[PDB]
Ligand binder design. Structure first.
Ligand SMILES: CCCCCCCO[C@@H]1C[C@@H](O)[C@H](O)[C@@H](CO)O1
Length: 158
């Protein structure tokens, strides 16, 4: 089991960490969602699907910088919504193919009432997402750590 980002940066068998740089909607009003869709950014596959079933969870998601300060967060994992920053490990997603499949993660961030101005700074760390991979074959328990960075400022109108 291994994963790669949209630009080809990979985390190999056994886990590790990688940076993900995301474009963000430049203007987000109070009452609206800023969507950070990682399903277009992170892709994974099973290296031995003939025999092994891989189990993949969002073990946890943490918020940083402007996102922690200025937004109220929800994460959708495989279509279901949970608090972000997270409060529990999600249900599993199975990877049973050698063909790359998106990691079905998206953040939905809505400004808090005190938010206004540059709510996310370009280049800043906005989130850390931990992908946990196990299987039905052995005792492997690996973490793939995704450090999410903003490519641009996000302005919340006042
Ligand atoms: C003949 C025996 C061959 C064993 C191959 C094991 C490959 O393991 C990796 C990491 C597992 O954690 C993972 O479950 C597996 C499949 O994605 O890929």
């Amino acid at each position: 089991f291994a994963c790669k980002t949209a630009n080809g940066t990979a985390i190999p068998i056994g886990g590790g960490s990688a940076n993900v740089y995301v474009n963000l909607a430049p203007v987000v009003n109070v009452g609206q969602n800023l969507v950070v869709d990682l399903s277009t950014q992170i892709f994974c596959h099973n290296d031995y699907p003939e025999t092994i079933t891989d189990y993949v969870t969002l073990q946890r998601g943490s918020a940083y910088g402007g996102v922690l300060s200025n937004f109220s967060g929800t994460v959708k994992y495989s279509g279901s919504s949970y608090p972000f920053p997270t409060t529990s490990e999600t249900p599993r997603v199975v990877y049973n193919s050698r063909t790359d499949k998106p990691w079905p993660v998206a953040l939905y961030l809505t400004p808090v009432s005190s938010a206004g101005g540059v709510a996310i700074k370009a280049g800043s760390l906005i989130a850390v997402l931990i992908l946990r991979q196990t299987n039905n074959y052995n005792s492997d328990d690996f973490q793939f750590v995704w450090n999410i960075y903003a490519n641009n400022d996000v302005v919340v109108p006042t």
